[PDB]
Nucleic acid binder design. Structure first.
Ligand SMILES: [Mg+2]
Ligand SMILES: [Mg+2]
Ligand SMILES: [Mg+2]
Ligand SMILES: [Mg+2]
Ligand SMILES: [Mg+2]
Ligand SMILES: [Mg+2]
Ligand SMILES: [Mg+2]
Ligand SMILES: [Mg+2]
Ligand SMILES: [Mg+2]
Ligand SMILES: [Mg+2]
Ligand SMILES: [Mg+2]
Ligand SMILES: [Mg+2]
Ligand SMILES: [Mg+2]
Ligand SMILES: [Mg+2]
Ligand SMILES: [Mg+2]
Ligand SMILES: [Mg+2]
Ligand SMILES: [Mg+2]
Ligand SMILES: [Mg+2]
Ligand SMILES: [Mg+2]
Ligand SMILES: [Mg+2]
Ligand SMILES: [Mg+2]
Ligand SMILES: [Mg+2]
Ligand SMILES: [Mg+2]
Ligand SMILES: [Mg+2]
Ligand SMILES: [Mg+2]
Ligand SMILES: [Mg+2]
Ligand SMILES: [Mg+2]
Ligand SMILES: [Mg+2]
Ligand SMILES: [Mg+2]
Ligand SMILES: [Mg+2]
Ligand SMILES: [Mg+2]
Ligand SMILES: [Mg+2]
Ligand SMILES: [Mg+2]
Ligand SMILES: [Mg+2]
Ligand SMILES: [Mg+2]
Ligand SMILES: [Mg+2]
Ligand SMILES: [Mg+2]
Ligand SMILES: [Mg+2]
Ligand SMILES: [Mg+2]
Ligand SMILES: [Mg+2]
Ligand SMILES: [Mg+2]
Ligand SMILES: [Mg+2]
Ligand SMILES: [Mg+2]
Ligand SMILES: [Mg+2]
Ligand SMILES: [Mg+2]
Ligand SMILES: [Mg+2]
Ligand SMILES: [Mg+2]
Ligand SMILES: [Mg+2]
Ligand SMILES: [Mg+2]
Ligand SMILES: [Mg+2]
Ligand SMILES: [Mg+2]
Ligand SMILES: [Mg+2]
Ligand SMILES: [Mg+2]
Ligand SMILES: [Mg+2]
Ligand SMILES: [Mg+2]
Ligand SMILES: [Mg+2]
Ligand SMILES: [Mg+2]
Ligand SMILES: [Mg+2]
Ligand SMILES: [Mg+2]
Ligand SMILES: [Mg+2]
Ligand SMILES: [Mg+2]
Ligand SMILES: [Mg+2]
Ligand SMILES: [Mg+2]
Ligand SMILES: [Mg+2]
Ligand SMILES: [Mg+2]
Ligand SMILES: [Mg+2]
Ligand SMILES: [Mg+2]
Ligand SMILES: [Mg+2]
Ligand SMILES: [Mg+2]
Ligand SMILES: [Mg+2]
Ligand SMILES: [Mg+2]
Ligand SMILES: [Mg+2]
Ligand SMILES: [Mg+2]
Ligand SMILES: [Mg+2]
Ligand SMILES: [Mg+2]
Ligand SMILES: [Mg+2]
Ligand SMILES: [Mg+2]
Ligand SMILES: [Mg+2]
Ligand SMILES: [Mg+2]
Ligand SMILES: [Mg+2]
Ligand SMILES: [Mg+2]
Ligand SMILES: [Mg+2]
Ligand SMILES: [Mg+2]
Ligand SMILES: [Mg+2]
Ligand SMILES: [Mg+2]
Ligand SMILES: [Mg+2]
Ligand SMILES: [Mg+2]
Ligand SMILES: [Mg+2]
Ligand SMILES: [Mg+2]
Ligand SMILES: [Mg+2]
Ligand SMILES: [Mg+2]
Ligand SMILES: [Mg+2]
Ligand SMILES: [Mg+2]
Ligand SMILES: [Mg+2]
Ligand SMILES: [Mg+2]
Ligand SMILES: [Mg+2]
Ligand SMILES: [Mg+2]
Ligand SMILES: [Mg+2]
Ligand SMILES: [Mg+2]
Ligand SMILES: [Mg+2]
Ligand SMILES: [Mg+2]
Ligand SMILES: [Mg+2]
Ligand SMILES: [Mg+2]
Ligand SMILES: [Mg+2]
Ligand SMILES: [Mg+2]
Ligand SMILES: [Mg+2]
Ligand SMILES: [Mg+2]
Ligand SMILES: [Mg+2]
Ligand SMILES: [Mg+2]
Ligand SMILES: [Mg+2]
Ligand SMILES: [Mg+2]
Ligand SMILES: [Mg+2]
Ligand SMILES: [Mg+2]
Ligand SMILES: [Mg+2]
Ligand SMILES: [Mg+2]
Ligand SMILES: [Mg+2]
Ligand SMILES: [Mg+2]
Ligand SMILES: [Mg+2]
Ligand SMILES: [Mg+2]
Ligand SMILES: [Mg+2]
Ligand SMILES: [Mg+2]
Ligand SMILES: [Mg+2]
Ligand SMILES: [Mg+2]
Ligand SMILES: [Mg+2]
Ligand SMILES: [Mg+2]
Ligand SMILES: [Mg+2]
Ligand SMILES: [Mg+2]
Ligand SMILES: [Mg+2]
Ligand SMILES: [Mg+2]
Ligand SMILES: [Mg+2]
Ligand SMILES: [Mg+2]
Ligand SMILES: [Mg+2]
Ligand SMILES: [Mg+2]
Ligand SMILES: [Mg+2]
Ligand SMILES: [Mg+2]
Ligand SMILES: [Mg+2]
Ligand SMILES: [Mg+2]
Ligand SMILES: [Mg+2]
Ligand SMILES: [Mg+2]
Ligand SMILES: [Mg+2]
Ligand SMILES: [Mg+2]
Ligand SMILES: [Mg+2]
Ligand SMILES: [Mg+2]
Ligand SMILES: [Mg+2]
Ligand SMILES: [Mg+2]
Ligand SMILES: [Mg+2]
Ligand SMILES: [Mg+2]
Ligand SMILES: [Mg+2]
Ligand SMILES: [Mg+2]
Ligand SMILES: [Mg+2]
Ligand SMILES: [Mg+2]
Ligand SMILES: [Mg+2]
Ligand SMILES: [Mg+2]
Ligand SMILES: [Mg+2]
Ligand SMILES: [Mg+2]
Ligand SMILES: [Mg+2]
Ligand SMILES: [Mg+2]
Ligand SMILES: [Mg+2]
Ligand SMILES: [Mg+2]
Ligand SMILES: [Mg+2]
Ligand SMILES: [Mg+2]
Ligand SMILES: [Mg+2]
Ligand SMILES: [Mg+2]
Ligand SMILES: [Mg+2]
Ligand SMILES: [Mg+2]
Ligand SMILES: [Mg+2]
Ligand SMILES: [Mg+2]
Ligand SMILES: [Mg+2]
Ligand SMILES: [Mg+2]
Ligand SMILES: [Mg+2]
Ligand SMILES: [Mg+2]
Length: 51
RNA sequence: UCCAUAGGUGCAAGAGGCGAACCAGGGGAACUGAAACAUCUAAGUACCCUGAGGAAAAGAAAUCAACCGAGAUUCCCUUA
RNA sequence: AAUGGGUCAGCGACUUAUAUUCAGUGGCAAGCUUAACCGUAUAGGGUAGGCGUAGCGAAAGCGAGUCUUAAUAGGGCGUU
RNA sequence: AACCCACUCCCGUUGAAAAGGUAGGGGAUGACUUGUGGAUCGGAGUGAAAGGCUAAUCAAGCUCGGAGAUAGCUGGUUCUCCUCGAAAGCUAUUUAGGUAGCGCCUCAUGUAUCACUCUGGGGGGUAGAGCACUGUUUCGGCUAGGGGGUCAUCCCGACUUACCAAACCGAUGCAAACUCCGAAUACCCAGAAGUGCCGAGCAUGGGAGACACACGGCGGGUGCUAACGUCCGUCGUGAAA
RNA sequence: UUAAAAACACAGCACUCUGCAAACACGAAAGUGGACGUAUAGGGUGUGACGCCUGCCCGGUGCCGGAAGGUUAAUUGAUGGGGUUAGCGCAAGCGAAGCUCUUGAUCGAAGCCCCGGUAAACGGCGGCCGUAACUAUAACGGUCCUAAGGUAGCGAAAUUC
RNA sequence: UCGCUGUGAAGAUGCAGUGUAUCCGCGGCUAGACGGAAAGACCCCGUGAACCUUUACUGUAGCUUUGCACUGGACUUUGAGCCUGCUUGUGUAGGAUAGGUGGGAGGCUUUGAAGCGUGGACGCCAGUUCGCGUGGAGCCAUCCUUGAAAUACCACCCUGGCAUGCUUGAGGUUCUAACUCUGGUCCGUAAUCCGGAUCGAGGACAGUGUAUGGUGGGCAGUUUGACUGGGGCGGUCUCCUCCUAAAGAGUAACGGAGGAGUACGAAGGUGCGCUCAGACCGGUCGGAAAUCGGUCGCAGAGUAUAAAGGCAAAAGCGCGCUUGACUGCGAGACAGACACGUCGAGCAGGUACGAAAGUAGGUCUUAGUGAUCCGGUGGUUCUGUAUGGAAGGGCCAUCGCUCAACGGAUAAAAGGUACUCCGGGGAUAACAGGCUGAUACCGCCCAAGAGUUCAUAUCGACGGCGGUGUUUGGCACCUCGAUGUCGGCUCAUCACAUCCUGGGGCUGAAGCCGGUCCCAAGGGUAUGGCUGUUCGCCAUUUAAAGUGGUACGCGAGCUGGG
RNA sequence: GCUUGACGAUCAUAGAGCGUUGGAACCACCUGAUCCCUUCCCGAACUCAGAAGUGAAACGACGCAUCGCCGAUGGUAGUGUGGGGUCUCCCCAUGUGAGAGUAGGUCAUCGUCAAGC
């Protein structure tokens, strides 16, 4: 099925977003830009683990 | 069993039993409640047993406080 | 043709204590009221304590404001 | 025979008797019967075993305490008058004969809306109807073709449609889960006259009860368009007249 | 005190435990019974004179034996990770020793897993296709499954719709 | 304190209509007063009770394993540590030797006794240490070159293991002195108890305390859902779509039909661009259907997934860029018992596509879900029990539940009761009564046909219409503070849809016998074998061995076989 | 007012089909692919530079009801309220009133601006 993952901001903040992904069809990591409330810009967010 | 130990008799003093409650200890339930029931509660209650007294118990900080201080134990009213 | 009563006389079922909330009726009034306890013992003392006069926030805290928030924007709660 | 037992019938059943009697019946020197004294008992005793017996009490004796155990369950609840006056529904529940919030009753305070009718706006997809879609039905025609035959062609041209025939044309029915259509009523909204028992509406508090409904009419499902059957909607009555 | 029997007991049979301070039972324990007995004895279990007999299955569950190897308790405390602070540092922050909070290496028996026995231990003991000079049925062949597929005797029976 | 027929919480002495009837005893019989007696024992219910079972849950007595204590000496085997000279150092390569550093450039203890070997050797083996057979004798030439670091040198750590020392894990043997003896003989003592003494035996075992693993219905406290045309068995329990649903919303049934417990980093955003299915004609292998060209076509295609409602600014299809599947909010509404749920303009921050107006807070919409408690992870100008910190707590973000009985009792749970018990219920079953009449039974309508011919002497297919309450059922209105249920005996009473006897019509009625229909209820209407039987089958009779109602008549009349 | 373009109003009485007609301007076809821009290939479509030719096609205007679409009057069905019957269904009084069909209509009607007279 789809497994819960965690997107950690590339800035120094500890802010993160949560989503799910199909780890069988798409094994490679996600590199997406999302708004970071602490620093107040859009920055690269990188996939990590939820556990 | 050699010494002396156990043991055996004779005297003196004391104890033993009863009593409704109160006190200090030893042992210690279940119904019930949780709208079921195991942790929990009822409750260290009911009950059983042992000591003491007119009361008993506890009592004179290896105690609390908070950088200011208080000043043995027991009981009552608050903090609640 | 469901229950109860053979009849009479007597007895027989919403109570009390402590904490509270609302209403009525009184005393004081930005204040009201004492508890244990003293006592000349229903008086008088005793204002420790309780409620009210300010709220918001989980809190530090700030205060007619405060919380959320980057925001004196909006919004929640509160204020003559 | 005595003595110990208890197989059968009848009587008795408010008995002479809370287990007997008259007739018959079994054992009767033995694993026999019996007197006196003694031992084992309450989750314990004893039992040639029936869950039997332990003082007329036994799938756990009696008695006194915990104790006024707990009882969403039955029963009962005592003088008088006046005003108002229900519900048997929704939701949830280890819930279904209990309880909780809401709907319905009553009292108090505050506040300004409410009902009926007329006029004017609005949406709908039901009754009815229809076949334009989806299905389903009958008749006639016209057929593409399967080819029934088939001259019978090594097997091809086809002789020809005496069987079948999609599709198309016309006529003709049906539908809770079909619709090219489409009411009456009922629902919202606004503006107005009068009536309202002097109020109707709304909000906030004090107290509840009730959450087993019944029949009759109308609209339906279920049943057999059977039931004083059962389950819904909407009125009326009973409940409480 | 509604059931006297086909129910219980029984003599006989079998299995199993027990070497004596016996197994076992009643007792918080002392002790007592077993028994002032001693394996021809004592306890438990099933069957139930006598006659003829008592077939197959150790896969499950139990019991007995084995001990190699896997797991496996309290116990032990290697290692790693933090808390405090003498000292250094402008600060930020680093920081020895002590005490302290965690982590858990190593050690560790029976048991269980494993291996083998045992049914008068608790238990279990089948199907489907063809095949004979009329028909019918298969002495005979295949084939699936199992731990193994009910023997001798008896049978509309205290069992048979 | 009458009968009958109706009515009626549905079987009336008491109600309605009607008929009978002076008032009161005694002896008898039991049909009724749903007669008396026992708050139904059968059935269901209660978040009731007892006792029993087990591979239900959780425990526990007993039995057993190991650590520590009581508990000691010696010897031996055996693993680790520590102490010790640290000798022991032999690969391409260096005569020879490669674990390294500091003093050091040569080594003059009998130099380094030199040339081979000699006993003990080891050995990445032909190399090295230790006595040169002779004897106090000059070779290893220090980079002599090579070798990654050169010997000889004096200190500092380590390595293959020897010899011991000091511990300490495990095993075996042995001893006596702890402990044990329900063994002997002496004493207390007049004593099979018990002590003390002494012989004998066992012996640091056994046993007991404490800690811990295994086993353990021997014993204990409990659990084991609800709905339900009675309970049980079966099925269901949360969410979405349609009908039922009566043209606003909502609306039940163990009513009729289907789906869900997901998917997608592009299947999202944006800008630009474009229209399907199908048919026919023509065209190489395919030929009905591949790709192609033309005409018609208007959505009969498509939409990630059920159905319904939608879809041209297409919401369908393709391409380029991209991350708005953004953070803080949020006027106002829809729904609604609550807890939850749904839509959303607009403002502030930063973005993405477009020239721009602009669009973007996921997907055409409606299913794809689980509260609180507890525990974990990332942050935090909060708190932090004398103080400074820390532990812990609070706040924000986020993980772990077929808790599917889906508003989820507990972290943790199955059965039997005919040995049963209590509180209740005709709120709910079995018997009888009531309603109904599908079924049952009895009539009638039509007439294909059978009857040699001939529809109706006698029958009668396919179909239709009634009657009676009379079987099997449906319902659950009465009775659970009790209305005794099959069959037999005794005694009955009524109906007529008549079995015999009586009177008739037709006949496929010669007579004697029959068949069928109409009228008729006065009187009659077997005995046995089997079986508990009603019934049925048999045997033998009779004029005939009728069918039904009466609580399937009759237990305060008998019986007790079922 | 007459003709042509662009944008609207309204969505078939406005559509479809058949036929006649329009080039002075406007529009359309048209020439070429050098330059911007383009084809998952093609200047086919989009785009650019135009002025030789035509009104063939497309578009517009005008006629025709064959089809499509509208559609009365009257009657019928259903239905709110009150009352009846022989009550699974109907009738009466009062108010309301379809769908289908029939007679019959339809080859639209407007607004703003710019160009030719
Ligand atoms: Mg005394
Ligand atoms: Mg308890
Ligand atoms: Mg309880
Ligand atoms: Mg309770
Ligand atoms: Mg209980
Ligand atoms: Mg307690
Ligand atoms: Mg105690
Ligand atoms: Mg005294
Ligand atoms: Mg003292
Ligand atoms: Mg003190
Ligand atoms: Mg001081
Ligand atoms: Mg003092
Ligand atoms: Mg009466
Ligand atoms: Mg009764
Ligand atoms: Mg009752
Ligand atoms: Mg009564
Ligand atoms: Mg009575
Ligand atoms: Mg006042
Ligand atoms: Mg504010
Ligand atoms: Mg405010
Ligand atoms: Mg006698
Ligand atoms: Mg006799
Ligand atoms: Mg006798
Ligand atoms: Mg006799
Ligand atoms: Mg005899
Ligand atoms: Mg005797
Ligand atoms: Mg006794
Ligand atoms: Mg007892
Ligand atoms: Mg029994
Ligand atoms: Mg007694
Ligand atoms: Mg007795
Ligand atoms: Mg109590
Ligand atoms: Mg009581
Ligand atoms: Mg009652
Ligand atoms: Mg009134
Ligand atoms: Mg719900
Ligand atoms: Mg109840
Ligand atoms: Mg109220
Ligand atoms: Mg209809
Ligand atoms: Mg149709
Ligand atoms: Mg046809
Ligand atoms: Mg319809
Ligand atoms: Mg008035
Ligand atoms: Mg209820
Ligand atoms: Mg309620
Ligand atoms: Mg109800
Ligand atoms: Mg009901
Ligand atoms: Mg109802
Ligand atoms: Mg009703
Ligand atoms: Mg009806
Ligand atoms: Mg109905
Ligand atoms: Mg009815
Ligand atoms: Mg009813
Ligand atoms: Mg009704
Ligand atoms: Mg009503
Ligand atoms: Mg009324
Ligand atoms: Mg009532
Ligand atoms: Mg009346
Ligand atoms: Mg006998
Ligand atoms: Mg007897
Ligand atoms: Mg017996
Ligand atoms: Mg034996
Ligand atoms: Mg036997
Ligand atoms: Mg036998
Ligand atoms: Mg084996
Ligand atoms: Mg075995
Ligand atoms: Mg073994
Ligand atoms: Mg440290
Ligand atoms: Mg190990
Ligand atoms: Mg082991
Ligand atoms: Mg064997
Ligand atoms: Mg056997
Ligand atoms: Mg045989
Ligand atoms: Mg047989
Ligand atoms: Mg026989
Ligand atoms: Mg059998
Ligand atoms: Mg009379
Ligand atoms: Mg009646
Ligand atoms: Mg009657
Ligand atoms: Mg009367
Ligand atoms: Mg009367
Ligand atoms: Mg009357
Ligand atoms: Mg009499
Ligand atoms: Mg009599
Ligand atoms: Mg009588
Ligand atoms: Mg009675
Ligand atoms: Mg009672
Ligand atoms: Mg009862
Ligand atoms: Mg029972
Ligand atoms: Mg329950
Ligand atoms: Mg309950
Ligand atoms: Mg002994
Ligand atoms: Mg002795
Ligand atoms: Mg000795
Ligand atoms: Mg030992
Ligand atoms: Mg030991
Ligand atoms: Mg021990
Ligand atoms: Mg031990
Ligand atoms: Mg048990
Ligand atoms: Mg038990
Ligand atoms: Mg257990
Ligand atoms: Mg037990
Ligand atoms: Mg209990
Ligand atoms: Mg229980
Ligand atoms: Mg439970
Ligand atoms: Mg139930
Ligand atoms: Mg049922
Ligand atoms: Mg029923
Ligand atoms: Mg079930
Ligand atoms: Mg509706
Ligand atoms: Mg409606
Ligand atoms: Mg309802
Ligand atoms: Mg489903
Ligand atoms: Mg899409
Ligand atoms: Mg659709
Ligand atoms: Mg478009
Ligand atoms: Mg609303
Ligand atoms: Mg831009
Ligand atoms: Mg912009
Ligand atoms: Mg919990
Ligand atoms: Mg501190
Ligand atoms: Mg903290
Ligand atoms: Mg539930
Ligand atoms: Mg639920
Ligand atoms: Mg629950
Ligand atoms: Mg039970
Ligand atoms: Mg009872
Ligand atoms: Mg009862
Ligand atoms: Mg009933
Ligand atoms: Mg019920
Ligand atoms: Mg009866
Ligand atoms: Mg009945
Ligand atoms: Mg009938
Ligand atoms: Mg014939
Ligand atoms: Mg009838
Ligand atoms: Mg009857
Ligand atoms: Mg009912
Ligand atoms: Mg009755
Ligand atoms: Mg009853
Ligand atoms: Mg009664
Ligand atoms: Mg009776
Ligand atoms: Mg008779
Ligand atoms: Mg009669
Ligand atoms: Mg007759
Ligand atoms: Mg007849
Ligand atoms: Mg007759
Ligand atoms: Mg006759
Ligand atoms: Mg005749
Ligand atoms: Mg007759
Ligand atoms: Mg007769
Ligand atoms: Mg007669
Ligand atoms: Mg007569
Ligand atoms: Mg006569
Ligand atoms: Mg007879
Ligand atoms: Mg007979
Ligand atoms: Mg018989
Ligand atoms: Mg009769
Ligand atoms: Mg009758
Ligand atoms: Mg009958
Ligand atoms: Mg009867
Ligand atoms: Mg009869
Ligand atoms: Mg009788
Ligand atoms: Mg009888
Ligand atoms: Mg009798
Ligand atoms: Mg009677
Ligand atoms: Mg009698
Ligand atoms: Mg009997
Ligand atoms: Mg008998
Ligand atoms: Mg009209
Ligand atoms: Mg019309
Ligand atoms: Mg029309």
């Amino acid at each position: 099925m789809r497994e819960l993952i965690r997107l950690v901001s590339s800035a120094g903040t500890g802010h993160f977003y949560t989503t799910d992904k199909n780890k069988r069809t798409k094994p490679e990591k996600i590199e997406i830009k999302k708004y970071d409330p602490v620093v107040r810009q859009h920055v690269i967010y990188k996939e990590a683990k939820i556990k």
